[PDB]
């Protein structure tokens, strides 16, 4: 038995910037300015739902951290501490990614700090589940995720995969980026996933996601395991041979797709 609020959109301007992150060779990620941040909160607890909406929104205003993971932790703790009859809470936070656009200023092409695209490509998501037991608050589940990562590799049939990739921290405090060097950014996981795949020669999907997982675990010893939900959406060939050219023509296949669920754990590295 449970209830709550879904589709709670919240946009925050000028959130505290994520700085001092640990950079990896496979990603240019060096932090987040956090000039504009959007999140889509789902709240489930084991009219009152309008209070939940307002509680979530005003807590995004008072939140002084750098990450969605920390925001959910904040909101989770504050819900349990201010509502006595509530025993369980599950929070889901879906990032609305904003990408800075070009700006031509002083005869020099640079990145804007004002104009941002609202992106509909891959997006991070965080889930947090917290319980009352029994005088202290315990975290029952926590993971962060990059969703809807759609990657096609041309030979040099071209493999087109959709990838959701999740990860769980050994130390749950490392997720909130208070110590920024122990935070695993979705940007870095995403770029890792494309650097692997590029380098692997004609790999299978289980082999591809196994190598991505091991590489993420190698690059981030904080993490206990990395899970994958993959989908195969490889195209159908219509013209196999083109005179002169190196390439082929393909088309959209029928709806059926192959999928795999697998998690690479610490021992498997």
Swiss-Prot record:
It comes from the Bacteria. Residues 1-269 are annotated as: Urate oxidase. Its EC number is 4.1.1.97, 1.7.3.3. The active site is at residues 5, 16, 49. Pathway: Purine metabolism; urate degradation; (S)-allantoin from urate: step 1/3; Purine metabolism; urate degradation; (S)-allantoin from urate: step 3/3. Induction: Expression is very low in excess nitrogen (glutamate plus ammonia) and is induced by TnrA during imiting-nitrogen conditions (glutamate). Expression is further induced when allantoin or uric acid are added during limiting-nitrogen conditions. Keywords: Decarboxylase, Lyase, Multifunctional enzyme, Oxidoreductase, Purine metabolism. In the N-terminal section; belongs to the OHCU decarboxylase family. In the C-terminal section; belongs to the uricase family. HIU and OHCU are unstable, they spontaneously decompose to form a racemic mixture of allantoin. Catalyzes two steps in the degradation of uric acid, i.e. the oxidation of uric acid to 5-hydroxyisourate (HIU) and the stereoselective decarboxylation of 2-oxo-4-hydroxy-4-carboxy-5-ureidoimidazoline (OHCU) to (S)-allantoin. This is Uric acid degradation bifunctional protein PucL. It comes from Bacillus subtilis (strain 168). The gene is pucL.
């Amino acid at each position: 038995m449970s209830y709550g609020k879904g589709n709670v959109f919240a946009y925050r301007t000028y959130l505290k910037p994520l700085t001092g992150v640990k950079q990896i060779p496979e990603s240019s990620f060096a932090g987040r300015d956090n000039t504009v941040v959007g999140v889509d909160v789902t709240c489930e607890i084991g009219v009152a739902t309008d209070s939940m909406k307002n509680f979530i929104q005003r807590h995004l205003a008072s939140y002084e951290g750098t990450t969605t993971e920390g925001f959910l932790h904040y909101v989770a703790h504050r819900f349990l501490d201010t509502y006595s009859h509530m025993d369980t809470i599950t929070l889901t936070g879906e990032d609305i990614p904003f990408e800075a656009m070009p700006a031509y200023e002083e005869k020099e092409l640079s990145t804007s700090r004002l104009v941002f695209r609202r992106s509909r490509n891959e997006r991070s998501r965080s889930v947090l589940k917290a319980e009352r037991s029994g005088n202290t608050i315990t975290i029952t589940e926590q993971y962060s995720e990059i969703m809807d990562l759609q990657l096609v590799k041309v030979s040099g049939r071209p493999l087109f995969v959709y990838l959701n990739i999740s990860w769980q921290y050994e130390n749950t405090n490392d997720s909130y980026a208070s110590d920024p060097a122990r935070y695993v950014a979705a940007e870095q996981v995403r770029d890792l996933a494309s650097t692997v795949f590029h380098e692997l020669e004609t790999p299978s999907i289980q082999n591809l996601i196994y190598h991505i997982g091991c590489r993420i675990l190698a690059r981030f010893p904080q993490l206990t395991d990395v899970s994958f939900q993959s989908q195969n959406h490889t195209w159908d060939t219509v013209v196999e041979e083109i005179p002169g050219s190196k390439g082929k023509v393909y088309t959209e296949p029928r709806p059926p797709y192959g999928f795999q669920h697998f998690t690479v754990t610490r021992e498997d590295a």
